[PDB]
Design a protein around this ligand. Structure first.
Ligand SMILES: [Zn+2]
Ligand SMILES: [Zn+2]
Ligand SMILES: [Zn+2]
Ligand SMILES: [Zn+2]
Lengths: 676, 141, 676, 141
């Protein structure tokens, strides 16, 4: 009668819970006894059976049950004892090799809506996640492709399951550098569980496996490095590529291929992990996997925009520390002179024409040395403000490479450039050199520019943020009803304005005059013209911009860590403004301290001004009006009290400000120097 | 010496076609263009190093530039470092079926040398897509 | 009646303990109550008063008391509470500046003979030692000079007090490298307490502050280093010298000045500290004093002969690591070629004449480079066996520098060397180069040679181990009774044999023929003739040997760490022989492991032979018959299994032995190569 | 220029006897024999550096060899390193009454710079019997 040994939670167990809710009087342990074998290892292999699971069963089974109160305490304690001795069911027994049936014990446990109660996180839930994080590759692949058919709120509350755990775990422990964060296994697990949820939103959302770019021609390395591959005979085979997550390889999908997920990617971040985690050795866990520690950079979606550069700063430094260490070795054993920097001779009249033959020399002769740290020198007379000298000199309409669109307030690659790919190389290089040296720029690019760099082309979806007056005039074709041959006089040939002013007739078809557009190939007219201005009018120019960008950040994990939205806050900076964090990120060099008066005079003169004029000040200290990406005190302020009448000595790089040993004795001339 | 299939790729493939023993083979480096040392001469066979053709000239290496430039590739093009276990689960192949060389001497890493890395839990090194290790001649102090 | 508030343990308290032992019936707490205020801080300042202490009181006061049983438990618990809050009585209150009276609370507590019971070491005794270790300098100076009047057994049982504590502390804890030994404060204290006992045996034993050498002419440094002192203007003032312990400066005495202590120095060693302590960072505590850690090399007497070189090996390595790092810098910025070694070109026919112009070039041109690591090269064809090529080539009578005395079986500096100071320079240098590179030599020097190098001359006491046939013939003068003018025909002039064979007449007085010896100036005849052969017949030759020795180990703490007895086991090695430690100090290089047969074949063929022939084997593996100083496995054996018929390849430096992949297949030719 | 008392020892003692300002003093190094740089010129006064006489020639230093050879003495002749407290108990003198220079720039260590070492518990360096520190110009990154 009691049905103990046979499979639990079935429709037979639905009638058993219904008839044991019949005659409720003194029924205290019988419901937990008739749900206890649900909390068993092999009893969910067998019960409820590209899978063999009945989702149509269980999501009505749990509904019938909730007319009581103690069963969530009864569901809990069985799973405390389930989870370790089922963790070794794949750690040691390795049962996915033995069956594809096995996954069903996760889903039935997962669909409990009273998991929303936080009483599981004492011990119960995370070790259920740990074996779920210890699943093998194709085991995770079918599991994720099972979750490619969810609704968003099913993914949302499943996302909110692990996020609430990593809400719980930061308020659990005080983490330190002897109190390491990668040795705690649950946050390793739950984020790796959330990675599958994050990779669910890839394959569950908008998919475009097709419109990738031309595969980026990885740079020819130097004559020494080419030699060694011929010495090792591996000149036949090519590189296996960058850092690649295996779930990208296991599902065969890329997150770059995802246009829109179920719920957008920026919601999938743990923020309080970031503010307590040091990526100084988490990046050491990234390039060097360790025994009892795992890298959070292999779950990059959990990090906000504040944090993913902070490891990329650490990544470039180890490529710069090594490129310091290389020319150590060349002066030692080869006797070739110590060149520990990317020195950059320029003249302010010719900095494009200076750095073109400068960089393309290093882009030809020794392609390695671009990974050395940037160091700018003028004639006569730095590197942070150097980019500002380039940016409007490159984003000038008068230099002939870009157009500004006033409504969108963003730039765009002008396709009317003739033999300007050389100057298009540098804007790629300086875009890498800004990123690689971690500097901020005042750049207004559409996101399609960042979208096209990572490896996915421009679509109809990217056309609006580029220029909507074209984009509206093609969606209005698609949002029309009429017989568009008799209604509209539009054929495949168009009129594209040269900077002479004359629009140039371009048959996007093989004969755009001879074939017209109907209702059906209205889709085909978009799929030529949406890609026309965005991808293939500027295709030789963009690849020469891509080649400039690629040979700076190819060896960087920038493609791995980042999405094209995240590049925008990474190369273009942020528009926020803090000062309470500024006054605490200042070690007392020179002698001046915070509570003495001439510290708060800078604070009060910018707080007298509005935000744009505080940024007019912070152009001098940071380098530009654009803040560092995310937070403001991530670059520290630097004070200097060294011996007045004139303007204080203030750099952009080392963030210094000279100070004489009252409040309003220098501020008029100081703001004068600011607004000069 | 120009077409790939006619010129030999290794010194055992060369020394008969180039009419010598393992001892009296006449060779010049790719970096230093010098008569290679006799320990260096024998290893280019054993470490299975491959013949460079600069301007149709079969070049070899000298050891002190071989260990140098391998240290250059180690410092300049280092992608990640992996346990000896972590190839058999991610490349999913036996390591003796895998061409992993030495990071210093560039001899292909031995079937017992690779099992040290699963015994003493020591990590490999991936550079340029290629895999590297530390040989037993390169394990003295 | 009870006498509570007034000063305790006085003769009034002697009659009070006697009259409270009168009528013993039910007297359980009264004796501990009448001894409790003895266990008080300020109550021993006042009670019992270059000092103001009554030793005549207390060493009969404790005698009257011991007719009972519970008072050693009663003496204990008061001192548990005394010791921390009296540790800050000089750590914070700093009472030695306030009085010289204060020291009396240590001595009264110390003279308890029931401290020999080990029940104090739970908590009680070491913190009594800690404040005694926290005494100030001149506070320790009078305290030690108070203990310069002890008997030996009073010092012995006081020595055995702290040694039993450091017997207790090693069996207390399992010390590691995360389980540091210098952060434990009691062993820091008790050894620093034992240092005073060790420095008691200096000033309590035989003192000779007078017969120091000529002050060693510290070498002229290189032209770069001389320049910087002229750039810093400090060419006026000289160096303040080596590592110097402040108690040596506080007492004004040196341990080198001590001929014989109360109980000899070699008894003052903790052996089980040495076998658990790593000097790898204890030497880092030596050159760099730290916050919560103190260097045991500042108590060098606690170490045996096994251990004091093990830090001196680490000391030379940091002088060799830096001298590696220096020629790193010269090839970098000066562009002067990488010279990371003391390369040494020789020809086996001329190695004295090779290394003389070799070393004296570096002893003149760049005096720094002798601290680089030794590297020996012949023509045609190493550095460990190189010294053996020098030793008999220097200790040959046929080279003309030394004589061998067959009875004593030791060498001696022959004073009959004419213009041989150049060859006398090298034997100093090679004696340093053996030590600095930590190599063992087969040298038979008298201890006076080591005695004269550290800074104390040769006495009558050192004459016997040099050559007793002279030494007996002057003590027999002093152990005679007769009127030695009428009895003995001896005047101050002597007959000293040249190697021509002719004895040379030498008036040791200003006119040794004209003044004869009587009973009184028989002392004066010794004090000329004891110093004659030992110090001033060879004085120009010994200083040229000293100058050779000095410019190698001046910057080393060899003078600090070591006594002239300890140099003998340090430069001359040891005559012990282990093999069980040898077979465990062998990591399996090549492939051969221990339990396979050809490991124990070396063991069994040397264990077939007697000891001298096992040393005939170990001349090949270590370098000589002389063992490493102290233990045998301190140099590791090294096995090699690489691919036979001929003799195995076996070095002396890297201790290698080649092995083909049975037991008696090679041993005849192997022992043949050994005994060739 | 030969007898010690007639030739001046410092540039403030020199510049009047050698008839100049602090700016237009004509000097050559001891290592490089070059016209010293003007920041370098002014510091030899302020860092109180002392005039070398090679063959009766008043020599000064250049900074890049000054910081070099001070690093040489740091690496070659290093005796022990001591807390800022540990001089006032063992030398038993005030540190402002003590000539401690910089280990890098060889300016005499400032009375506030020495109190950093008792504040932040940072250790001095003894070399050649002389004492050294780290100045505030030599504390940037
Ligand atoms: Zn070569
Ligand atoms: Zn190797
Ligand atoms: Zn100079
Ligand atoms: Zn300085």
């Amino acid at each position: 009668i009691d049905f103990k040994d046979v499979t639990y939670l079935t429709e037979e167990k639905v009638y058993e819970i219904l008839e044991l809710c019949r005659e409720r009087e003194d029924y205290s342990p019988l419901i937990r006894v008739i749900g206890r074998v649900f909390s068993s290892a092999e009893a969910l292999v067998q019960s409820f059976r590209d899978v063999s699971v009945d989702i149509d069963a269980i999501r009505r089974v749990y509904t019938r049950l909730l007319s009581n109160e103690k069963i969530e305490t009864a569901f809990l304690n069985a799973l405390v004892y389930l989870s370790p001795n089922v963790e070794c069911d794949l750690t040691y027994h390795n049962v996915y090799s033995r069956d594809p049936n096995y996954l069903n014990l996760f889903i039935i446990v997962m669909e409990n809506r009273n998991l929303h109660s936080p009483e599981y996180l004492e011990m119960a839930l995370p070790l259920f996640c740990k074996a779920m994080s210890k699943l093998p590759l194709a085991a995770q692949g079918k599991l994720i492709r099972l979750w490619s058919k969810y609704n968003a709120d099913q993914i949302r509350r499943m996302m909110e399951t692990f996020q609430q755990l990593i809400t719980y775990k930061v308020i659990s422990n005080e983490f330190n550098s002897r109190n390491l964060v990668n040795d705690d296994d649950a946050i390793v697990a739950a984020s790796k569980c959330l990675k599958m949820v994050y990779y669910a939103n890839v394959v569950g959302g908008e998919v475009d496996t097709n419109h990738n770019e031309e595969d980026d021609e990885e740079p020819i390395p130097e004559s020494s490095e080419l030699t060694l591959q011929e010495l090792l005979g591996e000149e036949r085979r090519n590189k296996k590529g960058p850092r690649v997550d295996p779930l990208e390889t296991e599902l065969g999908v890329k997150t770059l291929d995802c246009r829109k997920p179920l719920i957008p990617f920026e919601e999938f971040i743990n923020e309080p992990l970031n503010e307590v985690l040091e990526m100084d050795k988490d990046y050491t866990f990234f390039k060097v996997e360790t025994e009892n520690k795992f890298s959070f950079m292999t779950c990059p979606f959990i990090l906000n925009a504040v944090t993913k550069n902070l490891g990329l700063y650490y990544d470039n430094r180890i490529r710069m520390y090594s490129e310091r260490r290389i020319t150590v070795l060349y002066s030692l054993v080869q006797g070739q002179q110590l060149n520990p920097y990317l020195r950059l001779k320029v003249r302010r009249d010719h900095i494009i024409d200076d750095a073109l033959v400068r960089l393309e020399m290093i882009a030809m002769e020794n392609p390695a040395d671009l990974k050395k740290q940037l160091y700018v020198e003028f004639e006569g007379e730095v590197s942070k403000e150097f980019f500002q000298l380039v940016v409007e000199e490159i984003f000038n309409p008068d230099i002939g490479m870009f157009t500004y669109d006033e409504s969108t307030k963003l730039f765009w690659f002008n396709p009317s450039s003739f033999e300007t790919e050389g100057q298009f190389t540098l804007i790629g290089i300086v875009l890498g050199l800004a990123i690689y040296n971690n500097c901020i720029l005042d750049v207004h690019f559409p996101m399609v520019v960042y979208r096209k760099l990572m490896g996915k082309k421009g679509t109809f979806r990217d056309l609006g943020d580029s220029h909507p007056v074209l984009y509206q005039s093609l969606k209005d074709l698609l949002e029309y009803e009429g017989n568009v041959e008799d209604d509209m006089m539009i054929t495949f040939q168009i009129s594209q304005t040269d900077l002479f002013g004359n629009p140039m007739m371009y048959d996007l078809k093989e004969n755009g005059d001879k074939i017209p557009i109907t209702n059906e190939n209205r889709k085909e007219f978009v799929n030529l013209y949406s890609d026309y201005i965005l991808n293939k009018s500027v295709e030789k120019q963009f690849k020469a911009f891509r080649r400039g960008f690629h040979m700076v950040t190819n060896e960087s994990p920038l493609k791995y860590l980042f999405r094209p939205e995240e590049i925008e806050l990474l190369i273009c900076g942020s528009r926020n403004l803090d000062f309470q964090a500024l006054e605490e990120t200042t070690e007392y060099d020179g002698g001046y301290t915070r509570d003495s008066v001439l510290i708060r005079e800078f604070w009060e003169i910018v707080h007298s001004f509005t935000d744009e004029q505080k940024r007019l000040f912070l152009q001098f200290t940071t380098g530009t009006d654009r803040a560092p990406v995310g937070g403001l005190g991530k670059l520290k302020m630097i004070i200097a009290k060294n011996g007045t009448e004139r303007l204080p000595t203030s750099h952009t790089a080392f963030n210094v400000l000279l100070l004489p040993e009252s409040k309003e004795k220098l501020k008029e001339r100081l703001l004068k120097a600011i607004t000069y | 010496f120009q077409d790939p299939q006619e010129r030999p790729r290794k010194l055992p493939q060369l020394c008969t076609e180039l009419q010598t023993t393992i001892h009296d083979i006449i060779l010049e480096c790719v970096y230093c263009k010098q008569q290679l040392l006799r320990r260096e001469v024998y290893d280019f066979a054993f470490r299975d190093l491959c013949i460079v053709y600069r301007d149709g000239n079969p070049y070899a290496v000298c050891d002190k530039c071989l260990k140098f430039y391998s240290k250059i590739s180690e410092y300049r093009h280092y992608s990640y470092s992996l346990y000896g276990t972590t190839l058999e689960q991610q490349y999913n192949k036996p390591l003796s079926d895998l061409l992993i060389r030495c990071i210093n001497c560039q001899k292909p890493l031995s079937p017992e040398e690779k099992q040290r890395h699963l015994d003493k839990k020591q990590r490999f090194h991936n550079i340029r897509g290629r895999w590297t290790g530390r040989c037993m001649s390169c394990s003295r102090s």
